[PDB]
Amino acid sequence: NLDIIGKRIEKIKQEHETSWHYDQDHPYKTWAYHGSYETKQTASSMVNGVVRLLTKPWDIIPMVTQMAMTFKEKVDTRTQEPKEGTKKLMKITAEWLWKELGKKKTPRMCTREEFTRKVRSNAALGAIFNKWKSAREAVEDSGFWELVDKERNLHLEGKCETCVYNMMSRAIWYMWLGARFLEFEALGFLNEDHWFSRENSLSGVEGEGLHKLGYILRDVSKKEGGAMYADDTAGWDTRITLEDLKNEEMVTNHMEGEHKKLAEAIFKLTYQNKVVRVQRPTTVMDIISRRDQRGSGQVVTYGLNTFTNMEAQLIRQMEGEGVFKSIQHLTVTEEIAVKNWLVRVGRERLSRMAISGDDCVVKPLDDRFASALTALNDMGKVRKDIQQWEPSRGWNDWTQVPFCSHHFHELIMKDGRVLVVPCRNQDELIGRARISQGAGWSLRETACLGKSYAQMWSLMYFHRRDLRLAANAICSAVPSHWVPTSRTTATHEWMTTEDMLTVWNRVWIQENPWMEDKTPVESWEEIPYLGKREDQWCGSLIGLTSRATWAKNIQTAINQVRSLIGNEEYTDYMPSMKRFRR
Numbered sequence: 001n002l003d004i005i006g007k008r009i010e011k012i013k014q015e016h017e018t019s020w021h022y023d024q025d026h027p028y029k030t031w032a033y034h035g036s037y038e039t040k041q042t043a044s045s046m047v048n049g050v051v052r053l054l055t056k057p058w059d060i061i062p063m064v065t066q067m068a069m070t071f072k073e074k075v076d077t078r079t080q081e082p083k084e085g086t087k088k089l090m091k092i093t094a095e096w097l098w099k100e101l102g103k104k105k106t107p108r109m110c111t112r113e114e115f116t117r118k119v120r121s122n123a124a125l126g127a128i129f130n131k132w133k134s135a136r137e138a139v140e141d142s143g144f145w146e147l148v149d150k151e152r153n154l155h156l157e158g159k160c161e162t163c164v165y166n167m168m169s170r171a172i173w174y175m176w177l178g179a180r181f182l183e184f185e186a187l188g189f190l191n192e193d194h195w196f197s198r199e200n201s202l203s204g205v206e207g208e209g210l211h212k213l214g215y216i217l218r219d220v221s222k223k224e225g226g227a228m229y230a231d232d233t234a235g236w237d238t239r240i241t242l243e244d245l246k247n248e249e250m251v252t253n254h255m256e257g258e259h260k261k262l263a264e265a266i267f268k269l270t271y272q273n274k275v276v277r278v279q280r281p282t283t284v285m286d287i288i289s290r291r292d293q294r295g296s297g298q299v300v301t302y303g304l305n306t307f308t309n310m311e312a313q314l315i316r317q318m319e320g321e322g323v324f325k326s327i328q329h330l331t332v333t334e335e336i337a338v339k340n341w342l343v344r345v346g347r348e349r350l351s352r353m354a355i356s357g358d359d360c361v362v363k364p365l366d367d368r369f370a371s372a373l374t375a376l377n378d379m380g381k382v383r384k385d386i387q388q389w390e391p392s393r394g395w396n397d398w399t400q401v402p403f404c405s406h407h408f409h410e411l412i413m414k415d416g417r418v419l420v421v422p423c424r425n426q427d428e429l430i431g432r433a434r435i436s437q438g439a440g441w442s443l444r445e446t447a448c449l450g451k452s453y454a455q456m457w458s459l460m461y462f463h464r465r466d467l468r469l470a471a472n473a474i475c476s477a478v479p480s481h482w483v484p485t486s487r488t489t490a491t492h493e494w495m496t497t498e499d500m501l502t503v504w505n506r507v508w509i510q511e512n513p514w515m516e517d518k519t520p521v522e523s524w525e526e527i528p529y530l531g532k533r534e535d536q537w538c539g540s541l542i543g544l545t546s547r548a549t550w551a552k553n554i555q556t557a558i559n560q561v562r563s564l565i566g567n568e569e570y571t572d573y574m575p576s577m578k579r580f581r582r
């Protein structure tokens, strides 16, 4: 309690000495509350005019148009302590999992140099405004690094002064760039050195890319066993227990010297004890604390979610296979059985899973897994939209399994070769491409963001008639040499000025380990579409009068956008499609 968080609390007390008051009408039940102080401030979604002018039929589709318009009483809930048997299962599994992940890796600190480079090419590290304008400026000023230095030496002393969260089924905890640096220095290696790659972790998909995920699910489907299970957790980040945070901290057992000490401080002082500031309209700032739940940087959150999800799913697999009988208590001989299972078949059981943070697909040895719920429920990983003790429903076909907001189609090229392609409802794709975030977008910057969406569609969603046509239209409407951009940056092969046919050949043929025949594709007409009925099932407007008029008159839409942008060098990509090729 207050000995680890007090210093942080004390410091804030003073910067607002004119405003401090222990409010008696505070709305917190599960968060420990400390005090309040005076503020008065808040980021709505803006429309991308380039993409909207080239997607006119979707102007009358509410599922698209409603996306651009516009629970914190789930952050304020509590998880129960798991039973002794559960805690033992988790500790044995976590110990074994860090050793496996460590066999072909070496923990190490990330550098000021590495951090500086990340900030100087716009990765969302969730920082705040103050003393310097942007992150770009703070990193070049040596005063910052003295602030970082002061904190760094405070952490080696086992104490914290400035590592405080700012709150804003989503909840994002921004920190000041300094606290973010120290998190990255100690734990950045998990992402920077690919601990959750499929090669390293067997269950993981870190860095794999949307073009690989379907091939990975088809490889899991080839294993002998039961249905494919894809159970979503209800508010995963809020169900992370203090026992979870303690098993995650065991990565420090593989560290040495300074690194070990810096990493122990991040886990102890910032993850297993937290200090947060929250906007309350009644407008004040509330200084609240709690020991459990996930509140880390988004990138460390991804890696530790993947770890604890891999652990939870191996234990659910152990329950289905009868490795242990009850979660109340692991006997002496059950412990040795669990250890022996892990050593004997643990790596095989990891390969039966695809795990992306809180998102999983599991192909267990058989369907006993469906009704193996005691460990999963007692660890607090309660399933979404199903009653606590109702057996999971599994999927019989890998092409129907949801994963990372997609499903996957098997698509045969006219030349016999097999593509496994990513897909989702087309209203979701079009609605997202019509949205920008933040202020001060020039017309050129708005055009370059539209071009980023268009090139992603050409590479990932070429098989959707409407998206291949709209992607060609946007790329024809934006000057040929203008560089695609984003403001928060899977593997993004579409972020390039290289010709998209050359990039398609590299991704889907040359570098595709599931494609034996490396014969290059010479034109977009060799690249197939879904069946027309399947395209309609997944949200295509093919067949509607609105869509026919849009396609027939597309040059008029392209020319409207070219007229707004002005007298620039453009390329016509529409003749890459059979119907515009005369």
Ligand SMILES: c1ncc2c(n1)C[C@@H]1CC[C@H]2N1
Pocket (backbone or CB within 6 Å): 103, 104, 105, 106
């Ligand atoms: C153990 N620890 C770290 C690494 C390896 N093995 C293999 C390759 C070369 C360096 C890095 N990746």
Ligand SMILES: [Zn+2]
Pocket (backbone or CB within 6 Å): 151, 155, 159, 160, 161, 162, 163, 269
């Ligand atoms: Zn600190």
Ligand SMILES: [Zn+2]
Pocket (backbone or CB within 6 Å): 407, 409, 423, 424, 538
């Ligand atoms: Zn589909």
